[PDB]
């Protein structure tokens, strides 16, 4: 029932904070993955808070909320990272005090390939002059769309709802571009350009998941119970 | 020169470029390797895919090097969307060939296969529910070809001009179908979000194909280049 303007405002007010890496006056290659894992894990907690504020998300069953976050969490971490890296050519701003380049990526086997994809996405944002309002729409779309093709009377109802919210976010993107002064043709073209970036983000998440698993740590994905517990508040 | 086409000319060009539907190679008189049949079919389809790619307006204006790179990135996605398209009118089944219609139970005969079968079936069901039109389908397939490899100035600018042309064409089709402006952009977005699922399926499919430890998975640069038949 939200208007396009109300949708934008809701999403902007929902934005999580930018977190820091630990301070101690040197950085070492050996400690890099530990610092990244620590940031990712802290970002996840804020991500769950954020998701619950995306219009229509808490209308879903807790089960389906968990499934959507299971599907989307790394994509959401990535698009967040690319967004805060956009103004820093050649670098990934994991935190304001953890700004990393390609060569630092090389220290971890298999990492530079994923760094390069992320850097390429940052460059594409930059060449498109992606706006914050557009970014928060894209991030919401990822949340709602990434797990929807892999979820029953209840579920049919859930899927219809998700599609209706996704349509509203399309309307919102178009509203933003119209107010930005784009022609109808430029509006459709840019809508398309933005949504095609989501294919690349999905690609990066799958490649990244492969990479994280290859590292042989104790776990990679947030468990159902963990997501549930964070989501399943009293 | 390829960009000077109208939306109608673009649609007609893409429809005329469509590849044929191939048959599985086996004696239908003899007792019923599944992956063997599928691999044989995929490998034969790939050849027709390269010939289709050469007819997508704007594609051959790229260097041969870049044509090959795009095919390297897109080929499995393109195989998949074509499979889903011809499977649309066959709920619960994948029409790999007219003589090779498989259901998900048959897909369980190969380890790790049923998970990918289920994703493909879900996509075909989504297509059916949206009543995807052939004219929309050929636009989508062309977008996969141009978009899948674009994250690896003039060449990329050309690629984006062609992609913008296809967006224009899709909107034109929907406008002709009688959709309101709001319905047009909503449907455009719905179709493009399905492409992220097709990318997902290609990623999971590649993982699955590699896990089989067969002779090879991806077509080599030289194979694709030879199929392009350079002049
Ligand atoms: C994109 C990215 C990282 C990444 C992702 C894939 C890859 O192959 C290499 C690094 C790494 C990264 C490191 C570890 C990651 O997962 C660790 C496992 N936890 C995730 C959920 C929790 C239950 C366990 C996920 C990403 O660092 C980031 C930190 C951020 O705050 C935001 C994004 C990243
Ligand atoms: C989607 C699909 C198949 C598939 C893909 C991924 C997967 O995990 C399981 C089956 C299998 C499939 C089986 C083998 C495939 O690659 C084999 C390797 N060749 C591809 C190019 C050639 C150089 C080597 C690719 C797809 O069958 C299909 C046949 C078609 O005509 C169209 C689509 C498919």
Short mmCIF file of C-alpha atoms in Angstrom, two decimals, chain A residues 71 75 116-117 120-121 124 127 141 145-146 149-150 160 163 166-168 170-171 174 184-185 188-193 195-200 202-204 206-207 210, chain B residues 77 118-119 122-123 126 129 143 147-148 151 156 160 163-165 167-168 171 181-182 184-190 192-197 199-201 203-204 206-207:
data_model
loop_
_atom_site.label_atom_id
_atom_site.label_comp_id
_atom_site.label_asym_id
_atom_site.label_seq_id
_atom_site.Cartn_x
_atom_site.Cartn_y
_atom_site.Cartn_z
CA UNK A 71 19.77 -17.72 -0.47
CA UNK A 75 24.84 -11.45 -2.47
CA UNK A 116 38.49 -8.83 -9.54
CA UNK A 117 34.79 -9.54 -10.04
CA UNK A 120 34.53 -4.85 -11.85
CA UNK A 121 31.10 -4.43 -10.24
CA UNK A 124 30.21 -0.64 -13.35
CA UNK A 127 30.20 4.23 -14.83
CA UNK A 141 15.17 -6.98 -4.82
CA UNK A 145 14.11 -12.58 -5.46
CA UNK A 146 17.15 -14.76 -4.93
CA UNK A 149 12.59 -19.97 -7.34
CA UNK A 150 13.76 -22.53 -4.78
CA UNK A 160 2.26 -14.04 -4.92
CA UNK A 163 5.98 -10.83 -6.64
CA UNK A 166 8.92 -6.87 -6.26
CA UNK A 167 6.56 -5.11 -8.70
CA UNK A 168 6.26 -2.20 -6.25
CA UNK A 170 10.11 -1.83 -9.93
CA UNK A 171 7.58 1.00 -9.78
CA UNK A 174 10.96 3.86 -12.41
CA UNK A 184 10.67 6.95 -20.77
CA UNK A 185 13.18 5.25 -23.07
CA UNK A 188 13.43 1.37 -19.33
CA UNK A 189 17.03 1.15 -20.51
CA UNK A 190 18.44 1.99 -17.09
CA UNK A 191 15.97 -0.29 -15.33
CA UNK A 192 17.29 -3.10 -17.51
CA UNK A 193 20.95 -2.14 -16.98
CA UNK A 195 18.65 -5.51 -13.11
CA UNK A 196 21.27 -7.18 -15.32
CA UNK A 197 23.92 -6.29 -12.70
CA UNK A 198 21.99 -8.58 -10.37
CA UNK A 199 22.90 -11.51 -12.64
CA UNK A 200 26.56 -10.69 -12.10
CA UNK A 202 24.42 -13.80 -8.28
CA UNK A 203 27.39 -15.14 -10.24
CA UNK A 204 29.84 -13.61 -7.75
CA UNK A 206 28.13 -18.58 -6.29
CA UNK A 207 31.82 -18.28 -7.10
CA UNK A 210 32.73 -22.17 -3.81
CA UNK B 77 22.93 -20.48 -19.77
CA UNK B 118 14.16 -29.23 -10.16
CA UNK B 119 15.53 -25.75 -10.81
CA UNK B 122 10.68 -24.44 -11.72
CA UNK B 123 11.95 -22.08 -14.41
CA UNK B 126 7.59 -19.76 -14.14
CA UNK B 129 2.78 -18.85 -15.56
CA UNK B 143 20.55 -10.65 -23.67
CA UNK B 147 25.48 -9.79 -20.95
CA UNK B 148 26.94 -12.92 -19.43
CA UNK B 151 32.29 -8.19 -16.72
CA UNK B 156 31.80 -2.83 -24.19
CA UNK B 160 25.70 -1.97 -24.14
CA UNK B 163 21.61 -4.51 -25.03
CA UNK B 164 19.76 -1.16 -24.87
CA UNK B 165 18.33 -1.94 -28.33
CA UNK B 167 15.41 -3.56 -24.02
CA UNK B 168 13.70 -1.14 -26.44
CA UNK B 171 9.19 -2.84 -24.34
CA UNK B 181 3.33 1.52 -19.28
CA UNK B 182 3.29 0.28 -15.67
CA UNK B 184 5.46 -2.91 -19.35
CA UNK B 185 8.18 -2.02 -16.87
CA UNK B 186 6.88 -4.57 -14.35
CA UNK B 187 7.04 -7.35 -16.93
CA UNK B 188 10.47 -6.21 -18.16
CA UNK B 189 11.76 -6.50 -14.60
CA UNK B 190 10.13 -9.91 -14.04
CA UNK B 192 15.21 -9.88 -16.28
CA UNK B 193 15.06 -11.26 -12.74
CA UNK B 194 14.51 -14.75 -14.22
CA UNK B 195 17.88 -14.25 -15.98
CA UNK B 196 19.58 -14.09 -12.55
CA UNK B 197 18.03 -17.47 -11.77
CA UNK B 199 22.76 -17.59 -14.17
CA UNK B 200 22.36 -19.35 -10.81
CA UNK B 201 21.40 -22.59 -12.55
CA UNK B 203 26.69 -21.86 -11.93
CA UNK B 204 25.27 -24.86 -10.09
CA UNK B 206 28.86 -26.17 -14.00
CA UNK B 207 29.76 -27.26 -10.47
#
